[PDB]
Amino acid sequence: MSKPQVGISSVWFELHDLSAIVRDSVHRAGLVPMRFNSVGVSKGMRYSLQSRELIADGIETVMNAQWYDANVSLPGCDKNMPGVLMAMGRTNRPSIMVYGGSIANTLATAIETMGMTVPGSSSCPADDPKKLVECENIGEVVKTMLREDIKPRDVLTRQAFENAMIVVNILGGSTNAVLHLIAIADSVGIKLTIDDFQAVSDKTPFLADLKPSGKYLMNDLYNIGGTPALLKYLLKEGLIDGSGITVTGKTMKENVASWPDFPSDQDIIRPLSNPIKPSGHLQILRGSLAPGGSVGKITGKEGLRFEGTAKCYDYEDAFIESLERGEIKKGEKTVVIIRYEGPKGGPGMPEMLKPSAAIMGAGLGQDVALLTDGRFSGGSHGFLIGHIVPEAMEGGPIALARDGDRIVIDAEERVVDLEIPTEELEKRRKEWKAPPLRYQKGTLKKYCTLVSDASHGCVTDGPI
């Protein structure tokens, strides 16, 4: 009739149907439910990052074409969450995310931290009947959001992203969170830079005893109070601000007041007294090889300086095959560059799992540093640096390095330097020629045309 219409956006690929429960709750609250579905992530890696744009574009399109008054989003898989939040920032109409439930991914905890979910959503397991009851009572949350006009730009403030980076830092830190939180902040009109991540990492310790290098899993947090208990603990220590409005109509502090604290005998989150590391893992490095920035998680076991000989590879398998031929030697310090894997070169910055694993399997973690304009995934006992800007496809210095060049990685200076003369670097750029875009037609052709560099979250509609 004249009731508000609530779009219910799912990202589904064929266990309860959470979307059907949301629909019945929205109807019971006096609103009109409108379920719709979106494609998502669910060689194949080259479509993953650009699927985030398809989610943001698709949901924005339906929300605006039909002009739904509010949004409930069920991203399902964790990898569908960023594009879901970007669509909310574009419409800026009252919206809420319902996490699918627990099944080291920190982004769902960070999204609840920012207040785009009811308390416990991100830590409640998918099995639990409490996940069903959350969706059974989401209708009144949406009606309250419409009554009090709680919009994504009211909730996703600059301080909300500060809390998100801190919580991510506390739990170990994701390098993908750099891409996604910058893009999500961009969608609500907030300028978030890689240097903002460095600032948090300098002042915030690492407290979560989590695998692969720790003892516990993120699923273990639910049994000691879940995400609300974690926020209560960080609020008690004064590390986060709880005064920000959320989708419930209350602040973070008000939301978590009624939830129980951590049990005193918990060893998943270290006390501030005894941190696993006094500063954050995530480090931003620039220098003559990555003047536009780069991203790496630094444990401290890599050492504080790595100077070595460059060996360059224009695709992932080229490195693995040169490794298997014994062209990378023990006792020598070698800096491996795997380039043309960036946003446009990949395309889509495909996550490479094999380079870091192959170096541990050969006992070279202390003799080999890894650099790329794309992404690494596994862990290495040496330097793992990605997101190097400009990428090789754009003609950055990473494309101009040659075998035999000296490269320095300094973790305290936070530079990756190509030890060649500036005149020579400019001469090499005058000889470089851009290869064609990998795809001349289709969705990847359009994505390559629009995508920004990694230091801007690879947003595709023009960084603010």
Q: Is 273 a catalytic residue?
A: no
Cis link prior to 435 (omega < 30° from 0)? no
Which DSSP symbol is given to 215?
S
Question: In this structure, what token pair is assigned to residue 318?
Answer: 């080229």
Yes or no: say if 404 and 310 are a contact pair by the CB < 8 Å rule: yes
**Spatial contact of 185 and 163, defined as CB atoms under 8 Å apart:** no
Active-site residue (options: 377, 380, 452, 455): 377
305-313/334-338 β-pairing: parallel
What is the spatial distance between Cα 203 and Cα 15, in angstroms, rounded to a whole number? 41
Amino acid, single-letter form, for residue 131: K
Q: How many CB atoms lie within 10 A of CB 360?
A: 14
* Rounded CA separation 159/31 (Å): 32
DSSP 213: T
Task: Report the run of H or E that residue 70 belongs to, with start and end.
Answer: strand 70-74
Beta carbons of 443 and 348 less than 8 angstroms apart: no
The catalytic site residues sit at 377
